[PDB]
Amino acid sequence: SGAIYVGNYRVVNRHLATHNDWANLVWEDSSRDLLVSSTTAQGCDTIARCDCQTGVYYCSSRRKHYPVSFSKPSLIFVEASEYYPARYQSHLMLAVGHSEPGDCGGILRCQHGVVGIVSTGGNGLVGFADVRDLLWLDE
Ligand SMILES: Cc1ccccc1NC(=O)c1cncc(C(N)=O)c1
Ligand SMILES: [Zn+2]
């Protein structure tokens, strides 16, 4: 689990969105596993505006943060796992690292701010849905 709070927006994994998220929907993309809902409280996170390919992410299944190198956002085929099916997903970045389903929502951050959130995993890789291209989250 986990979310990004920037301005009056909440960014969450689309597959983890609640009834309140869908009732206050701002934007969603089923090809990216992202959904953004509106909030009454003002959030203070900052979204990175950059092309970094190194950062740190939080892994709840290890209660640890790990430094990683990651690929630029692209269209990737995600392999089938014990509990979830295989799929194609866009704007996804991969790194070598540990990820289990419940790790979705963990934030990847660089020196500039939030880069993305854990969205895929298995086979020794971790995949993050990028948010740096969503410029409208800044206004
Ligand atoms: C994160 C992870 C790690 C290991 C194994 C599997 C996963 N995948 C998920 O929990 C997951 C569940 N629902 C949807 C998606 C998606 N990106 O569409 C991903
Ligand atoms: Zn950066």
Q: How far is the CA of 50 from the centre of ligand 2 (A)?
A: 5
Method by which this entry was solved: X-ray
Q: What are the residue boundaries of the structural domains of the chain, listed by start?
A: 3-44, 45-139
In contact, 94 and 53? CB cutoff 8 Å:
no
Q: Between vectors from CA 83 to CA 77 and to CA 87, what angle results, nearest 5°?
A: 20
Q: How far is the CA of 64 from the centre of ligand 1 (A)?
A: 19
23-56: buried (b, 16+ CB within 10 Å) or exposed (e) per residue? eeebebeeebbbbbbebeeebebebbeeebeebe
Options 59, 91, 103, 104, the catalytic residue: 104
Residue entry with tokens 């392999």: 79
Cα 124 to the center of its chain, rounded Å: 18
Q: Between vectors from CA 115 to CA 112 and to CA 126, what angle results, nearest 5°?
A: 140
With the C-alpha atoms ordered 71, 72, 76, 80, is the resulting torsion angle positive or negative? positive
For residue 95, the number of C-alpha atoms closer than 13 Å in the C-beta half-sphere is 25
The tokens for 26 are 């701002």
Give the integer Cα–Cα distance in Å for 127 and 130. 9
Cα–Cα distances in angstroms (integers) from residue 57 to residues 25, 28, 32, 42, in the given order? 26, 23, 19, 24
The tokens for 52 are 């970094």
Residue entry with tokens 């709840």: 60
The tokens for 68 are 């990683």
Beta bridge partners of 35: 12, 28
Q: Is the CB of 103 under 6 A from ligand 1?
A: yes
Q: Is the CB of 15 under 6 A from ligand 1?
A: yes
Give the integer Cα–Cα distance in Å for 118 and 65. 12
For the residues of 6-75, what is the DSSP string, one character each? EEEEEEEEGGG--HHHHHTEEEEETTTTEEEEEEEEEEE--B--S---EEEEEEGGGTEEEEEE-PPSEE
Residue entry with tokens 């920037």: 6
Is 110 part of any known ligand binding site?
A: yes
Give me the resolution in angstroms, 1 decimal. 1.4
